[PDB]
Q: What sequence folds into this?
């Protein structure tokens, strides 16, 4: 399913996870958002307990979207040990996201 | 809606006038159009629904991201994937979307 | 950079809005013009325009650019 994350649950779910985090910055009325969502859902199952996957609604949680200067959407952000590691803009292919997952493991 | 119908028309007319085609997944085209419409309603202008803004209302007055935006008008680059160039793989071959499908995704 | 500077387009920018080539692909590189505006703020409020450097050329033809696409003279 991939859990959702807000302004109050950011620190915990994302910034403090001991496993690498891939966050999906999306919006209910952005075309491509509908397109990556399945891929982000499939990538969640594939890497259980290996990376942490969360969805962030930019409408619902405008404070974080501002905080990380998220401008184009969807963006996919990567976090290791509360450090902003990577920024991939747009309706990203699964392979590109896959290639990015490996770059952060053991 | 009368706004959605107005938005629908602009997308259909503009696509033809620019040699661009809607997504092969029309539900994507539907989402964008409706987002443009919702922005048309609350903001005045059809502000691009595929960006985050620190200030929506100031954004409407600089007009940059007012659809059709600067990138789409000068460089034909549309990241909502409303107006797709022929070489893009997501480009279907419709330049028309049924009024019916636009409400179906509003319910979906 | 600063309003009213002579700048050169030094990257492949393809436009479809040039009067000599209306609704056709036309590369801009190698052209020279003036910096009309650097879009960042409306009324002291921050804006997300991703092509901030507006350059006026001849024929009142103008185009928006990223800073890295243009160079001073
Ligand atoms: S990217 Fe530009 S052209 Fe495309 S839908 Fe958004 S505003 Fe319109």
A:
């Amino acid at each position: 399913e991939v859990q959702d994350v807000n302004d109050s649950s950011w620190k915990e779910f994302v910034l403090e996870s001991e496993v690498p985090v891939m966050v999906d910055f999306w919006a209910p009325w952005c075309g491509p958002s509908k397109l990556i969502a399945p891929v982000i859902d499939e990538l969640a199952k594939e890497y259980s307990g290996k990376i942490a996957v969360y969805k962030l609604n930019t409408d619902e949680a405008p404070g974080i979207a501002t905080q990380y200067n998220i401008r184009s959407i969807p963006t996919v952000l990567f976090f290791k040990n509360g450090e902003r590691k990577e920024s991939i803009i747009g309706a990203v292919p699964k392979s590109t996201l896959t290639d990015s997952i490996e770059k952060y493991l053991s | 809606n009368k706004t959605l119908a107005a938005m629908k028309n602009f997308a259909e007319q503009y696509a033809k006038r620019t040699d661009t085609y809607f997504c092969s997944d029309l539900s994507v085209t539907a989402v964008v159009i409706e987002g443009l419409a919702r922005h048309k309603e609350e903001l005045g202008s059809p502000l691009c629904p595929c960006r985050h803004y620190e200030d929506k209302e100031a954004e409407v007055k600089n007009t940059f991201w007012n659809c059709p935006c600067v990138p789409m008008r000068e460089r034909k680059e549309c990241h909502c994937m409303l107006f797709l160039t022929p070489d893009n793989d997501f480009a279907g071959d419709a330049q028309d979307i049924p009024m019916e499908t636009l409400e179906e995704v509003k319910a979906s | 950079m600063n309003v009213g500077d002579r700048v050169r387009v030094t990257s492949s920018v393809v436009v479809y809005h040039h009067p000599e080539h209306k609704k056709t692909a036309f590369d801009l590189q190698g052209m020279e013009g003036e910096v009309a505006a650097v879009l960042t703020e409306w009324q002291g409020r921050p804006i997300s325009a991703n092509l901030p450097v507006l350059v006026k050329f001849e024929q009142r033809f103008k185009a928006h650019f990223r800073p890295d696409e243009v160079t001073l003279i």
